[PDB]
Nucleic acid binder design. Structure first.
Ligand SMILES: [Mg+2]
Lengths: 44, 1324, 493, 98
DNA sequence: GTGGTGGATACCTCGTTGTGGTA
DNA sequence: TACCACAACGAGGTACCTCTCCACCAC
RNA sequence: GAGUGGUGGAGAGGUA
């Protein structure tokens, strides 16, 4: 209710939301992929 | 002894002479249901009580009423085996005769208008078996007794609620048996309140305000009266000496000439002695003492006619001036104290905004039904209905007992509703509790919790159903036709039968029966559950209800509870624990008589136990003299202490009476810790019966009690000699002494061969008597599933060594020899039922036939021409048992093949096929063959019945012939079958012969007509499910040998899992050459503290030493005198043993049969808490020519050499539990899927996968295996495209992963979007 | 994936924005929840606007006061009752004007509780004007319908159809919406149409959250119905039941037992579970070895269980790990990956060192076997979750592969010493001669002897010097020193 | 005192030796060995086996007046076992809430 | 068979969070 | 107007296995 | 264009 009122968005940077959504987690092995994807998305 | 008791005399070790036999262990179920169903016209219990408590019932005007006449229960048209097979309730019809008497409205009471009476049929109440089990829908269910809080009043107090103050708040509560509660409580301001059924608080005086009471009655009822008297502008105080206790003097309380107290001085008890020794009454009191007091009664001025002051007003100087000028010379005043009479009711009267009964009733209706537009008649009707309606409030005859005996009264009767003085006295005791005199109640003291059993619950459900049908039939009769209406048209039999069937089928307490073994049945019947309707839950009941209250001593076992979330909510009933009249629990106790315990047995309930002092069973008695020690031990007043040998009142009745049945079956109970003995007494309840039942050598003497009273053996009814014993049935010829002459003199004991249990184990009955062998009444004849000769025999006893063995018994693990498998000591039988139904689609009925398409001779070759497996073909998993096919198109066109298959992992033979049908489909060759075999076996068995019956009735007619006249030579010179044609002159014996021949022909008539009844019931269809045609049921019977993974356990909570089946050469042996069978783990003993297995291992080795010496003497065949001497010396052994057996009364063949029965060991009885001490065990071992410590010197079969230290070896009784590794192991590669979330299923039946839960997701997260977590949440799970690419890629050899958004996340998106909150996936 | 919509006749209130405390309407309109509840219970009227001085804006009136206002003015004001009244009020309320009024009215006095409520309302209004939502949108006019395959309808075995709760809830709201439609085009009396509006409002509040507003409407089987909020939230809601933890394919389960003959990285998988778990790998190897051409022939060749299938399984298993999970997987080391070895039987064999990490006792504990599929997951289960990599627990740098109770009894019995047992005071060349003596039996395990031990001191760098002297020890300690590697001193043993 | 005498009379018992003298050493007793190596159980459990079981507690936080003067070799009587069940059921409900 | 549909139990234990009451 | 009882909502362990039972009405 | 239903939900009991 509060998030719908405020119109929030989630940046998808935690392990719980990346486990819900279904990508690699931003830890362990997947941290290299996540910093690569975030520098690609910042780079264009 | 009996003839079966001479067959094997179990040696005792107990020393206390037991004084009471073990009671009939199923008395609670049978006595409660017999009280529910039995016709009591005087002592109203059950059905007659409910009928008379609802009948009669009149109309709205009163011109017609229904009178109850009588009721009778007919025969069940099916017996219990037929109901178990067919899958239906075993029940009797309830036929009630009922009278309709119509009244006239022309006359004032025109009773003679029209008389009508008939029997109306309503309801089908289910009956009980002989041994306390109900049979519903074919299955055997058991209704567990319930332990709710009894009706009445319970004064309680929560300690530490207002954490700022920490004050105690005593709260009362009136729990009735039926209706609504009534809760009084204080606040931290010490104001009484009323909370009817967890609504808001109300000022507590409003109930008695609604009860037509004014404030004057309130103050004179609750507060004691003090009197001020104004005289010539001074105040005279009438003073009783019981008022100045523990306070400070406001003024100088003096006398006419005596001084007692000073200013600001505490009134002392010596000063009170001075006042009671001078005995003055009137004392003058100054003006400042009045300021603080409160006026009792109203004072209206006589001149102006208005009220100077009402009741409950604070006095002041202007107020006393107004009273003196009005002239009220006598002043009534309340008594206010802080010690014994606190200002509580006065404060609630002050804060109470109501004034009269009208405002009280509209306020209480505004609370009870809020928001409704209130009125006076609705408020008063709901108030009468809420407490003082007989049809809306019942607590009688047990709550009336507890209410009077908690209100310090004497009589145990009264009315079934509350009343004014009753609520007044409850409030009075609450104020006494609040000021200090009295004592609060605890809530788990067993004078408060009451056993509510199956009879009471069934009567309550019958009463609720009858009330609903009474309301319906009154709504019918109030306007319907009077003269031309029979009552069977107006009594709808629907809600009674629906209610009783609902209770016996789907209640909280009618639960499915675990019958792994007779112990499980008996301790599932004697079970005390505290859950269900009216009791607590398995969430909302913390440490208080679970803990062992000290009044559980003797009534409830302390070491038999489940270990799950029901750690104290499921009590088990102790051995000797009976039930009261009202329903409380009670134990037997022996009365002392001037220091002598006379064997008259007084029963003590939970409350009457507390006032006496009770001695303990371990207290010694000197041959019916007195105690030895002057300071005996006792338990008293809720604890334990010491007392004198004359001050006592009662002694224990035995020493088994603390523990229940199951924990009494454990030997050496007094040496196990309570945790591990609880683990053992729960793991004896799960022992699958093995192939040949084998007795325990170390028992407790309760085994014969469990196997007899568990109702699974075939115990004789009248003693006699056996006439013919078979493997299928035993018949017996009765003694002529124990025969009544009206009968024929032959009982028949049919046995149930290889029938499925409720947990798919086997149940059969092998006979234990041979032909030409006399038995007495109460003897055993046929052993049950896990019984050896009428003893309970759950597992097998086997050789045990206690040492580490190359790691293979590491952390509670068991290493089992090969010879345990080779002797097949642990191969159970599992009988499994598979069902096939011919449903009906709307394209034709499904066909059971062998012309199935798409199949060949790799499957159809086991089946017959009819499409049904033979009786006896060994199937394997996945083969067709019943070939069923379904019309696919309209009526090949039967293309879909819906045959049965054996589930993968099930094997074995097909012991029975049973086929049911509906009338409407014509049978086939297989159904005709099954019904022909049933017909022929029914005719065969009932004609054998007729044949032994004509043997008996020909004995009967030869008896009446030799009684009437003397006719012997023509009686035996002529065949016995033509004894109906012989006769003489017509007299009473001739007429008896004609009527007995007519009785024989009528026996033939009921014979052939019950054959025709079973014939038409098997040819005609049974009342099956809606929309089936014929039902074929098969029964597969595997034989489960042991293998690594089958759980095993002794009796003392030493569970294990079999780790290796070593060969006989690798098992350790001893120097004589005998290899040991189980190498247990020695480190299981010293920390878990179950020393019972160590003492039982030593005693088992002693027992086998004696049995081995007897086997040596028999195999050398020494002498019957040497056998008699050795066995007599073996029995007359202990110090002060209870039993005594002399073999001079035993014959030669008797002692030969006894030595043959003892050649496999000498069984021993170690009573729980009367056990065999280690000196007695070492005496037994010295008799056996063994090492006295029990430890022998084992060798090593692996490398030949010697173990360095002596190893303990004996014979512990190992079970085999119901956790079999074949049922446990399950795997899944790719299978079924759910519909909502598209993730795989869950469970071994649906072939589902293991839930990789949240904790395992955190495990992968904190490892960092991100790719493993992603592939475990997308492609191994709910993602259809990714999993299809994954499966295809793995088959092609390349392991690569294309992920995607999971289907459960898409479900969550659709659910929030349908909830109305716009959630979407924003790109970049 | 398709959605439906319901045209509601009357507007209605979303119960989340009425009963999720604080309701956001009770803080939006600055009115108490009791008054808004009495409006939506259809028991009282509120004027929207009034030109007279008697009726101020947002003044709640009872029905008697309502009809008194009708006989007094009747024309100038407008007092309505129900969700359309609060919908019109939400339309008429000006967000920027009232937040400016709040910002000018805050700064005069600063009392704590009223200042808190005022800054709560300013955060609400600023969040609304930031997000661009409308305050009118809290009132539902078009109620959406879930896709039909997420409230599915599969029957029972006997043809009787057992639905979900949502079909019943939607049936109730659709039937009462049709009856309200019939009464609006019939132009019913106002008491009847407001009673049916009450019942529609209660039905849609039940649909959005059953056990929330009042009496939860129970199902046909004497149980409360499951709403959309009860299908989302919970210990068995969608999140914590099917999103965080999923049931998974490629997974077995069995009773555990003890394998002392293993090594640190091995577990004994049964034949049957391994043949089931590695089934598509077996299909792939069968098609690669030219024996299988189609999927049906591969399926039936596995389900016939030939010796070529057993050989192919023995080749597939070779150095391909499996994850032996145990639940309750409390700490991090509850999942470890082992290279499986094939056994017959039906029970997973563990090492005895890892059953301290698992807190396993072999008295009937069951464990799961999860397979990794991809190359990334096999390399993660070899290089991260192997049993030989989590030696030390992450709670303390002290190892978790400690011997436990039986190895401990054996090593204690090895390294303890008696006084004059058998052959004490001998002199031995080393562990080889000492163990030859003990296995021959000429000297017991507790004789105090002298031995020559060539222990290896490791220096400051990684070089290994060899020193040699005579130590006065036990025969058992001399035998254990043969096991102890090169690099440790002797006072260890 | 009973626990101290028990641990002494368990620890130093293999005294029958020779070849120096009648020497006193640490014992090869099996219960003491399995408790002394750190294998299974500790001195409290050994005391409960051999010495004195001690003062068990009522569920209300109190201490019972009379202790369990027996142990798990001589075997308890009825009253000491009924006392012990208080601590047993308190432990096994403590595990559920814990 | 095919649309229609409204009433006679109580028996957790904290622990935050919001609300009318009153010195 | 700042403390304050009082009321209302919102938590309460993971994994597994076996069994039974499922809305009334109705011209 | 080529076989097929429990999960759903309740209640009761059990294992670690
Ligand atoms: Mg375990």
């Amino acid at each position: 209710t509060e998030a719908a009122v405020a119109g929030k968005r989630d940046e998808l940077r935690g392990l719980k939301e990346n486990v819900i959504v279904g990508r690699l987690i931003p830890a362990g092995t997947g941290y290299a992929y996540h910093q690569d994807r975030m520098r690609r998305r910042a780079a264009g | 002894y009996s003839y079966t008791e001479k067959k094997r005399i179990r040696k005792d070790f107990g020393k206390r002479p037991q004084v009471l036999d073990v009671p009939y262990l199923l008395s609670i179920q049978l006595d409660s249901f017999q009280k529910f169903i039995e016709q009591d016209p005087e002592g109203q219990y059950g059905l007659e009580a409910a009928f008379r408590s609802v009948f009669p019932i009149q109309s709205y005007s009163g011109n017609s009423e229904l009178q109850y006449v009588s009721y009778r229960l007919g025969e069940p048209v099916f017996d219990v085996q037929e109901c178990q097979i067919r899958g239906v309730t075993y029940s009797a019809p309830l036929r009630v005769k009922l009278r309709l008497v119509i009244y006239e409205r022309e006359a004032p009471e025109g009773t003679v208008k029209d008389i009508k009476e008939q029997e109306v049929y309503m309801g089908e109440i289910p009956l009980m078996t002989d041994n306390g089990t109900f049979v519903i829908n074919g299955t055997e269910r058991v209704i567990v007794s319930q332990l709710h809080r009894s009706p009445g009043v319970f004064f309680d107090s929560d300690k530490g609620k207002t954490h700022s103050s920490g004050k105690v708040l005593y709260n009362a509560r009136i729990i009735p048996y039926r209706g609504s509660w009534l809760d009084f409580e204080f606040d931290p301001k010490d104001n009484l309140f009323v909370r009817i059924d967890r609504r808001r608080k109300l000022p507590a005086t409003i109930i008695l305000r609604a009860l037509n009471y004014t404030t004057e009655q309130i103050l004179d009822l609750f507060f004691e009266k003090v009197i001020f008297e104004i005289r010539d502008n001074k105040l005279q105080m009438e003073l009783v000496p019981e008022r100045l206790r523990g306070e400070t003097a406001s003024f100088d309380i003096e006398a006419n000439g005596k001084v007692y107290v000073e200013k600001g001085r505490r009134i002392t008890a010596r000063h009170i002695r001075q006042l009671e020794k001078d005995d003055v009454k009137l004392i003058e009191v100054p003006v400042e003492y009045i300021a603080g007091k409160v006026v009792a009664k109203d004072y209206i001025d006589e001149s102006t006619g208005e009220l100077i002051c009402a009741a409950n007003m604070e006095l002041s100087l202007d107020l006393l001036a107004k009273l003196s000028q009005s002239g009220h010379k006598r002043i009534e005043t309340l008594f206010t104290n802080d010690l014994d009479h606190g200002p509580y009711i006065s404060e609630t009267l002050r804060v109470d905004p109501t004034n009269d009964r009208l405002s009280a009733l509209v306020e209480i209706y505004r609370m009870m039904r809020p928001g409704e537009p209130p009125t006076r008649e609705a408020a008063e009707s709901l108030f009468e209905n809420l407490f003082f309606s007989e049809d809306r409030y019942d607590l009688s005859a047990v709550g009336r007992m507890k209410f009077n005996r908690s209100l310090l009264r004497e009589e145990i009767e009264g009315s079934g509703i509350l009343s004014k003085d009753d609520i007044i006295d409850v409030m009075k005791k609450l104020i006494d509790i609040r000021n200090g005199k009295g004592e609060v109640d605890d809530i788990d003291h067993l004078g408060n919790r009451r056993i509510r059993s199956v009879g009471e619950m069934a009567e309550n459900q019958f009463r609720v159903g009858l009330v609903r049908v009474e309301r319906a039939v009154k709504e019918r009769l109030s306007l319907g036709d009077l003269d031309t209406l029979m009552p069977q048209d107006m009594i709808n039999a629907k809600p009674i039968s629906a209610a009783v069937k609902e209770f016996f089928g789907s209640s909280q307490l009618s639960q499915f029966m675990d019958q792994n073994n007779p112990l499980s049945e008996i301790t599932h019947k004697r079970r005390i559950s505290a859950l269900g309707p009216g009791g607590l839950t398995r969430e909302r009941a913390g440490f208080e209800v679970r803990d062992v209250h000290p009044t559980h001593y003797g009534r409830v076992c302390p070491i038999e509870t489940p270990e799950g979330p029901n750690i104290g909510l499921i009590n088990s009933l102790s051995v000797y624990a009976q039930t009261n009249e009202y329903g409380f629990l009670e134990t037997p106790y022996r009365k002392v008589t001037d220091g002598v315990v006379t064997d008259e047995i007084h029963y003590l309930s939970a409350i009457e136990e507390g006032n006496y002092v009770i001695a303990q069973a371990n207290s010694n008695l000197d041959e019916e003299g007195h105690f030895v020690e002057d300071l005996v031990t006792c338990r008293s007043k809720g604890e334990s202490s010491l007392f004198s040998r004359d001050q006592v009142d009662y002694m224990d009745v035995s020493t088994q009476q603390v523990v229940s049945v199951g924990a009494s079956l454990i030997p050496f109970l007094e040496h196990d810790d309570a945790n591990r003995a609880l683990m053992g007494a729960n793991m004896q309840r799960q022992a699958v019966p093995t192939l040949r039942a084998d007795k325990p050598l170390v028992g407790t003497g309760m085994e014969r009690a469990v196997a007899v009273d568990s109702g699974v053996t075939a115990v004789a009814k009248r003693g006699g000699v056996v006439q013919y014993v078979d493997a299928s049935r035993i018949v017996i010829k009765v003694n002529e002494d124990e025969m009544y002459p009206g009968e024929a003199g032959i009982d028949i004991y049919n046995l149930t061969k290889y029938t499925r249990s409720n947990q798919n184990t086997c149940i059969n009955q092998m006979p234990c008597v041979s032909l030409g062998e006399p038995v007495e009444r109460g003897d055993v004849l046929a052993d049950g599933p896990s019984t050896d000769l009428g003893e309970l025999a759950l597992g097998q006893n086997m050789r045990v060594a206690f040492m580490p063995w190359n790691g293979y018994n590491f952390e509670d693990s068991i290493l089992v020899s090969e010879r345990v498998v080779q002797e097949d000591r642990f191969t159970t039988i599992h009988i499994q039922e598979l069902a096939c139904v011919s449903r009906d689609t709307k394209l034709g009925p499904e066909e059971i036939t062998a012309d199935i398409p798409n199949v060949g001779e790799a499957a159809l070759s086991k089946l017959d021409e009819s499409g049904i497996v033979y009786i006896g073909a060994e199937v394997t998993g996945g083969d067709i048992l019943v070939g069923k096919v379904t019309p696919k198109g309209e009526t090949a066109s039967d293309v879909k093949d819906s045959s049965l298959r054996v589930p993968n992992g099930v094997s074995g033979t097909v012991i029975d096929v049973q086929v049911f049908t509906r009338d409407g489909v014509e049978k086939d060759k297989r159904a005709l063959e099954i019904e022909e075999m049933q017909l022929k076996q029914a005719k065969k068995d009932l004609s054998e019945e007729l044949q032994i019956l004509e043997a008996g009735l020909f004995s009967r007619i030869r008896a009446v012939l030799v009684a009437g006249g003397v006719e012997a030579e023509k009686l035996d010179k002529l065949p016995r079958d033509r004894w109906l044609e012989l006769g003489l002159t017509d007299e009473e014996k001739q007429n008896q012969l004609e009527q007995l021949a007519e009785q024989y022909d009528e026996l033939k008539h009921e014979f052939e007509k019950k054959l025709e009844a079973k014939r038409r019931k098997i040819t005609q269809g049974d009342d099956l499910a809606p929309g089936v045609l014929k039902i074929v049921k098969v029964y597969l019977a595997v034989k489960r040998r042991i293998q690594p993974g089958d759980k095993m356990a002794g009796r003392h909570g030493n569970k294990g899992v079999i780790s290796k089946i070593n060969p006989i050469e690798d098992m350790p042996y001893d120097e004589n050459g005998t290899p040991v069978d189980i190498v247990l783990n020695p480190l299981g003993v010293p920390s878990r503290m179950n020393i019972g297995q160590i003492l039982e291992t030593h005693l088992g080795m002693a027992a086998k030493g004696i049995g081995d010496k007897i086997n040596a003497m028999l195999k050398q065949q020494q002498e019957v005198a040497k056998l008699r001497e050795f066995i007599q010396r073996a029995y007359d052994l202990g110090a002060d043993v209870r039993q005594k057996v002399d073999l001079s009364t035993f014959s030669d063949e008797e002692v030969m049969r006894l030595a043959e029965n003892l050649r496999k060991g000498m069984p021993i009885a170690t009573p729980v808490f009367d056990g065999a001490k280690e000196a007695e065990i070492k005496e037994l071992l010295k008799l056996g020519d063994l090492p006295t410590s029990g430890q022998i010197r084992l060798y090593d079969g692996r490398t030949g050499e010697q173990f360095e230290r002596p190893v303990t070896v004996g014979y512990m009784y190992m079970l085999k539990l119901n956790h079999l590794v074949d049922d446990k192991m399950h795997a899944r590669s790719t299978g079924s899927y759910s519909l909502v979330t598209q993730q795989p299923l869950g469970g071994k039946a649906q072939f589902g996968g293991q839930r990789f839960g949240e904790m395992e997701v955190w495990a992968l997260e904190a490892y960092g295996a991100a790719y493993t977590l992603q592939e475990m949440l997308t492609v191994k799970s709910d993602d259809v495209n990714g999993r299809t690419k994954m499966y295809k890629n793995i088959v092609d050899g390349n392991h690569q992963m294309e992920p995607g958004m999971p289907e459960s996340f898409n479900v969550l998106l659709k659910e929030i979007r349908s909830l109305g909150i716009n959630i979407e996936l924003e790109d970049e | 994936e398709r959605m439906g919509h319901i045209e509601l006749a009357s507007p209605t209130a979303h119960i989340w924005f009425l009963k999720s405390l604080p309701s956001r309407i009770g803080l939006l309109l600055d009115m108490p929840l009791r008054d808004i509840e009495r409006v939506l219970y259809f028991e009282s009227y509120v004027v929207i606007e009034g030109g007279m001085t008697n009726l101020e804006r947002q003044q709640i009136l009872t029905e008697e006061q309502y009809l008194d206002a009708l006989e007094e003015f009747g024309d100038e004001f407008d007092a309505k009752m129900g969700a359309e009244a609060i919908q019109a009020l939400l339309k008429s309320m000006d967000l920027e004007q009232e937040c400016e009024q709040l910002r000018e009215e805050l700064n005069e006095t600063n009392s704590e509780t009223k200042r808190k409520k005022l800054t709560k309302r300013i955060k609400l209004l600023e969040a609304f004007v930031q997000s661009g939502n409308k305050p009118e949108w809290m009132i539902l006019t078009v109620l959406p319908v879930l896709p039909p395959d997420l409230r599915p309808l599969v029957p029972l075995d006997g043809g009787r159809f057992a639905t979900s709760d949502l079909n019943d809830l939607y049936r109730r709201v659709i039937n009462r919406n049709n009856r309200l439609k019939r009464l609006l085009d019939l132009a019913a009396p106002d008491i009847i149409v407001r009673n049916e509006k009450r019942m529609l409002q209660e039905a849609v509040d039940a649909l959005l959250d059953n056990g929330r507003r009042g009496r939860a409407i129970t199902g046909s089987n004497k149980r409360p119905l499951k709403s959309l909020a009860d299908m989302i939230k919970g210990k068995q809601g969608r999140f914590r039941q099917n999103l965080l933890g999923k049931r998974v394919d490629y997974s077995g389960r069995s009773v555990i037992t003890v394998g002392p003959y293993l090594r640190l990285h091995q577990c004994g998988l049964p034949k049957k579970m391994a043949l089931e778990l590695f089934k598509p790998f077996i299909y792939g190897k069968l098609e690669l070895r030219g024996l299988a051409t189609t999927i049906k022939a591969a399926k039936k060749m596995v389900e016939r269980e030939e010796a070529v299938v057993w050989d192919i399984l023995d080749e597939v298993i070779r150095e391909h790990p499996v994850l032996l999970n145990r639940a309750p997987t409390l700490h991090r080391l509850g999942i470890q990956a082992f290279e499986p070895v094939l056994i017959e039987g039906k029970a997973i064999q563990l090492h005895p060192l890892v059953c301290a990490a698992y807190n396993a006792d072999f008295d009937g504990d069951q464990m799961a076997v999860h397979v990794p599929l991809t190359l990334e997951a096999q390399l993660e289960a070899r290089a991260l979750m192997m049993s030989t990599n989590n030696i030390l627990s992450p709670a303390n740098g002290e190892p978790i592969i400690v011997p436990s109770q039986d190895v401990v009894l054996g090593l204690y019995y090895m390294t303890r010493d008696c006084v004059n047992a058998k052959g004490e005071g001998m002199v031995l060349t080393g562990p080889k001669e000492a163990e030859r003596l003990y296995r021959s039996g000429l000297a017991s395990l507790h004789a105090r002897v002298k031995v020559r031990i060539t222990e290896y001191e490791k220096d400051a760098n990684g070089e290994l010097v060899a020193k040699t002297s005579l130590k006065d020890t036990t025969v058992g300690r001399a035998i254990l020193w043969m096991i102890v590697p090169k690099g440790l001193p002797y006072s260890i043993v | 005192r009973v626990s101290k005498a028990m641990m002494d009379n368990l620890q130093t018992e293999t005294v029958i030796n020779r070849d120096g003298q009648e020497e006193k050493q640490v014992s090869f007793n099996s219960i003491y060995m399995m408790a002394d190596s750190g294998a299974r159980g500790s001195a409290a459990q050994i005391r409960q086996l051999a010495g004195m079981r001690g003062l068990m507690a009522k569920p209300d936080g109190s201490i019972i007046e009379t202790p369990i003067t027996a142990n798990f070799r001589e075997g308890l009587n009825v009253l000491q076992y009924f006392i012990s069940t208080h601590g047993a059921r308190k432990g096994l409900a403590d595990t559920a809430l814990k």
